[PDB]
Amino acid sequence: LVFGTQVDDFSTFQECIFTQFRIILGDINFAEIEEANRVLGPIYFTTFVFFMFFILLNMFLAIINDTYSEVKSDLAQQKAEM
Amino acid sequence: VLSVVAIGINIYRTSNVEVLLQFLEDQNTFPNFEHLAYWQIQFNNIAAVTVFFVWIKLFKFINFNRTMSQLSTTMSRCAKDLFGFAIMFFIIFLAYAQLAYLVFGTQVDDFSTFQECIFTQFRIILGDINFAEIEEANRVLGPIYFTTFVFFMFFILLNMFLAIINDTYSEVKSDLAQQKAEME
Amino acid sequence: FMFFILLNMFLAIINDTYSEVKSDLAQQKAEM
Amino acid sequence: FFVWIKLFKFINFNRTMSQLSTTMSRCAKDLFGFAIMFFIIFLAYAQLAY
Amino acid sequence: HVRFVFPEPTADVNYIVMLTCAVCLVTYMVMAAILHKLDQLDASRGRAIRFKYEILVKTGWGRGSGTTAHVGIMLYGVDSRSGHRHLDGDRAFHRNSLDIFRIATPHSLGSVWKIRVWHDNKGLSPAWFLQHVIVRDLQTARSAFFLVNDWLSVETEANGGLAALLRFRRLLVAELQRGFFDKHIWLSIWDRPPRSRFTRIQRATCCVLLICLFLGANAVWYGAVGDSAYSTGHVSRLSPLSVDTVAVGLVSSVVVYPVYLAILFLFRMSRSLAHGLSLLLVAVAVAVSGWVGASFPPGVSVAWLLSSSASFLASFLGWEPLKVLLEALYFFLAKEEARKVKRLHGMLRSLLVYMLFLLVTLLASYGDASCHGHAYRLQSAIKQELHSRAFLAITRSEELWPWMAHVLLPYVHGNQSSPELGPPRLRQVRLQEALYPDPPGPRVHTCSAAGGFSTSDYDVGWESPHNGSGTWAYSAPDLLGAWSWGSCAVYDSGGYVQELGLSLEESRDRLRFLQLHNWLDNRSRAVFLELTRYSPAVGLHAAVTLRLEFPAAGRALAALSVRPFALRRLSAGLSLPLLTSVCLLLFAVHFAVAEARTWHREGRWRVLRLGAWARWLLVALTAATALVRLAQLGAADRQWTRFVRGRPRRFTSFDQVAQLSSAARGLAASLLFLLLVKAAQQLRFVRQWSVFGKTLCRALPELLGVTLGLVVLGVAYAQLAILLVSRLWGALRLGAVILRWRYHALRGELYRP
Amino acid sequence: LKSVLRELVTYLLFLIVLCILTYGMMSSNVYYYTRMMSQLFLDTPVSKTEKTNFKTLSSMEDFWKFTEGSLLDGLYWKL
């Protein structure tokens, strides 16, 4: 809705999704995002980076790390106590 | 509140199209359509923010089973610790940003303003900014700033979010399972 | 499926091993 | 390269370096087991892209 | 009516006014939190419960004294003033009881004559003359046991040493020692007596009201009432003239005083409604200050600060003591709470010291931040006018001359050109031309064909026979000015100069003479183009310089720099940099003396710990910042005074001022970084937020060991990568496993035990 | 446990010898010579009226022109 007519990376909905997947890898311009909208352009980028790299991508790791240790302890206890 | 503001803007903007009628009377004048463009931009911003928040509101209803309830509990239980650590992290962030602004801000153009310093330091986190300008700006303090910033905000300060989140998830799962086993 | 699911299976193994090794070493040294 | 790698033997017997070496040697089997699984999927994706 | 007007003259926003009112609020908030935490303890201590002894002091004064009564003791003295005791015990003043009391009173009285004992006759008159309880010495040896053994009316007192006999000497001295540090609201948050209904937390509200009202009332006069005398700008001396600043401060304080009086009178004797009005007054005063300060010339903000400072010293040294004197004339856990209060008072003092130091640093760094956006645009414009892309591509082909004649001369002598602050110049350092260094496989950057520079006075051409002196002489470096860390080595301010100015139609002749008569060849180690810019619109100079290095005798190395600086002089009065330098020097002296006191009160062997090193680093930065700013201020005046004499003829090489003006800015911005880092670690004083620092400190050796391992494994891989034909930590977060274990450990160590 | 220091000093001697022996295999003119030969050919265009070099060959007649003009020019200056 904000960059949909100016940035060529957000021209369509699919383009927005793919650009947001590429932002995670660390592949941005940000020279056109800022000049397309001086307010609400930097806000989007900063809040997206914060809520995705700091908080949301750190939960898959937590889930997998917990489950692996639980399974390891379960199997070790089952085998040893037999 | 945002919806009321958007409705007010839409009613106020579309009720004064006297400029279009005045142009359509005599078509040798200069069509003055700048106010309409400004209000269209403002309405677009308000509508986009309203839509984003309305979509965020959907979390209020996805608690239909245990596997979602524990995730919501984990997310709402570590917010107290993340808010406490973010204050320290962002104090250090702004301390770096002001130093970069005062030192490199005269002759880089990437640190030319405080906002530019903040955005450049966010882009460094993504591994998007590479040291090519801070060298020619200052061949001695540029390397020091970059090395120290990368060390103290990749190896130390950015991994303290993950420790908090992982420990909170583990403790929530553990005591929830303990309560389930004992009570039921 | 290769940044969220398969690169978190590496640090998981490393973390479990680190925790158990440190616990064993602590209960060994601090006890004797 | 191998001569440089052999240096670890002389710094592994430290107070704080001896809890990371044993950690990385106790999980070598699991790391190899994870690497095989990773490479199978990597090669499947590579063949699909090809 | 012409006096008060709404100026709104210029949009030049002033940061001195808002940075002073933005610290007095954070200080108030933090100090209010501390005082609330202290209040919670103080109220319980007062509602619950040594200059004497603690021996068995069961009283045997006599019988016929059966009554449940309580007594009180006023053991005043040197800064100590205890209260009455409770009525608790086994007998609790039963029929024909005794009297003995040893309470945990922290008021350690001095060895002076200041004591009173009040006995209440709760019931019929007793026939036993209960003299006193005996006490000689247990903890401090400040007790004297000399009782009177009398019996007065109900609830009567008796005063000794260590009906109406005297009125104007005893009833009055009891108030100049009890209310002198209680009615004096400045030194009142530390010495509030217990069981008082003023709470020590609304005292801070009145104090911040005073500070903000002082600031607002001074900002009104400086900026609004500027016609009653015609002083702001015309005759206002920045320095205190004993009539320009202090008088305004005293008048402002006396004018604003009878609003604080009303607010305090509503607070005291009110057993609120003023807790909101005080905040409203502070908010409106801050808003007025912020709206009026946006139009202060830079020489008036320092006067405003001095006036506000003077005001504070008036309301501290002659207006509160006058108030208290007028009022007088009108009338096991104990050893833990003691430690808690002692630590909290030190916290309160350190908070104010740190907040003053932070304000001084902020005014030293961001005092003139409005001239920071103009410098970037100015230097960019200078670089784009000079076409700073062809010059950096200049190789030695006898081709700097067309560039000089194409873009430089029109820039210097154009109709719509720069003020230029004088004529440009060229330099030359050299001796014994390189013997055609080896071409094949050139050195990357280590081209350092060792040689030496000349010094003799040669003549036109390359021979100086019997023509006398030398014409093409060698201007000896002028010293303490410039160095130009060039690629080759370290150049200086010496060499052979060429005017190259004076009405361009003449400059062509000089250019062709330099081209044709064999000047720049056959040694050719430097040229050193250099000029100076001045833009009156924003008020910035610029030290433009360009240099060409000839290390391989046939190829060139170009380097240019533009350094916009502001010309501040010592003779310009008491400017803000001078004030923030003389205050920073005092702060550095205070910190050094405090460190020496610890050095001599703990002794040697205090090395190898971080406290001493951190303190010495802080002292070094403060003392270096102040000294570098003073040096820049001195050099800027020296160069200007030299430039004025012989204005159209000399060059004066303003680069040395530009170097100091950037070193001083880079130093005062790193000190503030240390100050802002020190505030982050003070979040440990919150209960559950104290674990982050501990887990980042205990888990440091493991992270350092991992870093060492990665350094070794990276150098090995680098050595393999080279020679063959020619991350492991970031992505797969492996530091989240070392910090997490320590976090879990130190968090379980805080709840379970 | 004194043989540990003996092994350490022997290994440090070996490593200091090997570092020098491998720094002696990083001459400047072994890489710059290749970089200047790969530019003397492969970058100079055909004799005239063309811009395509060897790196951007496009047809058979282009190869013949490269063999005649550019190859017989870079091999022989005017061992």
The Cα of B14 is separated from the nearest Cα of chain E by a number of Å equal to 35
Q: Among A53, B18, B66, which Cα is nearest to E730's?
A: A53
Q: Three-state DSSP class for A37?
A: coil
* From A24, A57, A64, residue closest to C12, measured CB to CB: A64
- Interface contact flag, D26 C22, Cβ < 8 Å: no
Rounded Cα distance, E412 and E419, in Å: 9
Contact E20, E359 (CB under 8 A): yes
Residue E211: both structure tokens together: 């500070």
Tokens of A22: 């590429």
Residues 6+ apart with CB under 8 A from B170: A62, A66
What is the token pair recorded at B2? 């945002």
Strands E529-535, E557-561: pairing is: unpaired
Distance from CA of E702 to the nearest CA of D (A): 6
Q: Within 10 A of E112 (CB to CB), how many other CB atoms are there? A: 12
Give yes or no for E440 touching F (CB within 8 A).
yes
What is the maximal distance between C-alpha atoms in chain B?
85
Whether the CB-CB separation of E192 and E200 falls below 8 Å is answered with: yes
| Touching chains, F (3+ CB pairs < 8 A) | D, E
- For chain E, the residue count is 753
Q: Are strands E540-549 and E557-561 parallel, antiparallel or unpaired?
A: antiparallel
Tokens 């086993």 found at: B181
**Distance separating alpha carbons of residues E704 and D16, to the nearest angstrom:** 9
3-class secondary-structure state, position A74: helix
In angstroms, what separates the C-alpha of E439 from chain F's closest C-alpha? 12
DSSP three-state, residue B54:
helix
Kindly list the partner chains of chain E, i.e. chains with 3 or more CB atom pairs below 8 Å: B, C, D, F
Q: Residues of E172-211 as b/e, b for ≥16 C-beta within 10 angstroms?
A: eebbebebbbbbebeebbeebbeeeebbbbbbbbbbbbbb
Burial class (CB in 10 A: 0-12, 13-18, 19+), E3: exposed
Query: Can you tell me the distance from the alpha carbon of E481 to that of E494, in angstroms, rounded to the nearest whole number?
Result: 10
C contact test, residue of A68, A71, A77 with most C CBs within 10 A: A68
Resolution (A): 3.3
Is residue C4 less than 8 Å (CB to CB) from chain A?
yes
Burial A49-79 (b: 16+ CB within 10 A, else e): beeebbbebbbebbbbbbebbeebeeeeeee
Could you tell me how many CB contacts below 8 A there are between chain A and chain B?
60
Residues just before a chain gap in chain E (C–N exceeding 2.5 Å) are: 49, 162, 271, 331, 726
Helices of type H across B15-78: 18-25, 34-56, 66-77
DSSP E495: B
Say whether B115 counts as a known binding-site residue. no
Q: Are F52 and F45 in contact (CB under 8 A)?
A: yes
Q: Return d(Cα B143, Cα B132) in angstroms, integer.
A: 10
CB E478 within 8 A of CB E493: yes
Contact E712 D7 (CB under 8 A): yes
Other beta carbons within 10 angstroms of residue E316's beta carbon come to: 16
Taking the Cβ of residue A31 and every Cβ of chain B, the question of whether any pair is shorter than 8 Å is answered with: no
Closest by CA position to E553, among listed E523, E576, E581: E523
Two tokens, residue E657? 């001022």
State the Cα angle at E714 between E709 and E718, rounded to 5°.
155
List chain A residues with CB under 8 Å of C15.
65, 69
Give the H/E segment covering residue E157: strand E156-159
CA B150/CA B121 separation, integer angstroms: 10
- Let me know if chains A and F touch, i.e. at least 3 Cβ pairs under 8 angstroms: no
Name the strand (E) or helix (H) holding E565: strand E564-565
CB contact under 8 A, C12 and A65: yes
DSSP E637-652: HHHHHHHHTTTTT---
**Three-state secondary-structure class, residue E544:** strand
User: Are E108 and E92 contacting, i.e. CB atoms less than 8 angstroms apart?
Assistant: no
E5 and E224 Cβ atoms separated by less than 8 Å: yes
Interior CA angle at E181 toward E176 and E185, to 5°?
125
Do chains C and D meet with 3 or more Cβ pairs nearer than 8 Å? Answer: yes
Write the DSSP string, C1-32. Answer: --SSSSSHHHHHHHHHHHHHHHHHHHHHHTT-
Residues 259-278, chain E: which have Cβ within 8 Å of B? none
Q: Tell me the chain C residues in contact with residue D41 when contact means C-beta distances shorter than 8 Å.
A: 1-2, 6
**Interatomic CA distance for residues E232 and E222, integer angstroms:** 7
CB atoms within 10 A of CB E510: 14
Main-chain phi, psi angles of E557, to 5 degrees: -135, 115
C-alpha span between E175 and E188 (Å, rounded): 15
Helix (H, G, I), strand (E, B) or coil at F21: helix
Partner-chain contact C11 E733, CB within 8 Å: yes
Q: CB E441 to CB F22 under 8 A?
A: no
> Do A1 and B128 lie within an 8 Å CB cutoff?
no
Region of residue E553 (left: phi > 0; alpha: psi -120 to 50; beta: else): left
Of C6, C9, C17, the CB nearest to D26: C17
User: Which experimental approach was used here?
Assistant: cryo-EM
- CB atoms closer than 10 angstroms to residue E563: 21
Q: Do E708 and D20 touch (CB under 8 A)?
A: no
Which amino acid, residue C30? A
Chain E residues with CB-CB distance to C19 below 8 A: 737, 741
Measured distance CA(E503)–CA(E618) in Å, rounded? 53
CA distance E240 to E748: 60
Q: B160–E695: do the CB atoms touch at under 8 Å?
A: yes
> Rounded to whole angstroms, how far apart are CA atoms E231 and E365?
29
List the structure tokens of F59.
């047809």
How far is the alpha carbon of A80 from chain B, nearest alpha carbon, in Å?
22
Instruction: Name subunits touching A (3+ CB pairs < 8 A).
Output: B, C
Q: Select from F15, F17, F23 the residue whose CB has the most chain D CBs within 10 Å, as the one to mutate to test that interface.
A: F15
Pick from A57, A61, A68: which is nearest to C16 by CB? A68
Residue E707 CB contacts under 8 Å (≥ 6 apart), including other chains: B155
Is D6 near chain C, with CB under 8 Å?
A: no
Interface contact C2, partner D, CB < 8 A:
yes
A contacts of B158 (beta carbons < 8 Å): 54
D41 Cβ contact list (under 8 Å, min separation 6): C1, C2, C6
Q: Does C23 touch chain A (CB under 8 A)?
A: no
Asked whether E150 and E158 are in contact (CB, 8 A), the reply is yes
Cβ–Cβ gap E719/F22 under 8 Å: yes
Give, as one character, the DSSP assignment of residue E548: E
User: DSSP secondary-structure letter at E125?
Assistant: P
- Residues of E within 8 A of F31 (CB-CB) are 726
- Between CA B138 and CA B143 the distance in angstroms is 8
Name which of D15, E179, A59 is nearest B82 in CA terms: A59
Q: Which of F25, F26, F32 sits opposite E441 (nearest CB)?
A: F32
The CA distance from B163 to E473, in Å, is: 71
As a whole number of angstroms, the distance between CA B109 and CA E114 comes to: 71
Q: Which residues of F touch E715 (CB under 8 A)?
A: none
CA distance E718 to chain C (A): 24
Distances (CA, A) of E475 to B82, E492, E728: 65, 11, 59
- The span from the CA of E267 to the CA of E262, in Å, is 9
Q: Which residues of A touch C3 (CB under 8 A)?
A: 24
Say if the Cβ atoms of C11 and E737 lie within 8 Å: yes
